Paper text:
Recently, genomic evidence has implicated a critical role for disulfide bonds in the structural stabilization of intracellular proteins from certain of these organisms, contrary to the conventional view that structural disulfide bonds are exclusively extracellular. Considering the apparent abundance of disulfide bonding in [name], proteins containing multiple cysteines in their amino acid sequences would be expected to have a high likelihood of containing disulfide bonds. To test this, a 98-residue protein containing six cysteine residues was selected from the [name] genome for structural characterization. The protein (GI 18312142) could not be assigned a function or three-dimensional fold in advance, as it had no recognizable sequence similarity to proteins of known function or structure.
The crystal structure of the protein was determined to a resolution of 1.6 Å with an R-factor of 18.4%. The remaining 18 residues form a small C-terminal domain of novel fold that interacts with the N-terminal domain exclusively through hydrophobic contacts. The three-dimensional structure reveals that the six cysteine residues in the primary sequence are paired to form three disulfide bonds in the native fold (C22–C34, C24–C54, and C80–C83). Although one disulfide bond (C80–C83) fits the sequence of a potential metal-binding/active-site CxxC motif, the C22–C34 and C24–C54 disulfide bonds do not fit any known metal-binding or active-site motifs and appear to serve structural roles within the protein fold. Of the 16 [name] proteins whose structures have been determined to date, a total of 29 cysteine residues have been visualized, and 23 of these have been found to form disulfide bonds. Despite the still relatively small sample size, these numbers provide important three-dimensional structural support for the claim of abundant disulfide bonds in this organism, meriting a further survey of thermophilic protein structures. In every case where more than one cysteine is present within a [name] protein of known structure, a disulfide bond is found. As expected, [name], an organism singled out in earlier studies, exhibits a high propensity for cysteines to be in close proximity, with pairs of cysteine residues appearing in proximity nearly ten times more often than expected by chance. Some organisms have evidently modulated their internal biochemistry to enable disulfide bonding as a key mechanism for stabilizing their proteins at high temperatures.
Numbering used by the authors: 1 to 101
Amino acid sequence: MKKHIIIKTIPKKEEIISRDLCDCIYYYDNSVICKPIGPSKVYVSTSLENLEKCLQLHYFKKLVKNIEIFDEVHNSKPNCDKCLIVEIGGVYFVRRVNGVP
């Protein structure tokens, strides 16, 4: 299942990391999307397993500090309350709280 992942990178390398991660993941998932999204942050949409196959290569291990996994992305303010909403670019990432009816 696709997730909406924010990767924290070292400073100044967002654009190259986005480009190179998309060229690595394409083999596993021809539908991947990547973009640089803020200072020290890259967006990727793919399954977590496909991301990790690439993030464990030597080249990416050096450049990536952490990741944050979200369930949804919206271009307008989301309407949920029982959730975490993070705005990066002018894009809204949502992580839902489990067990809400």
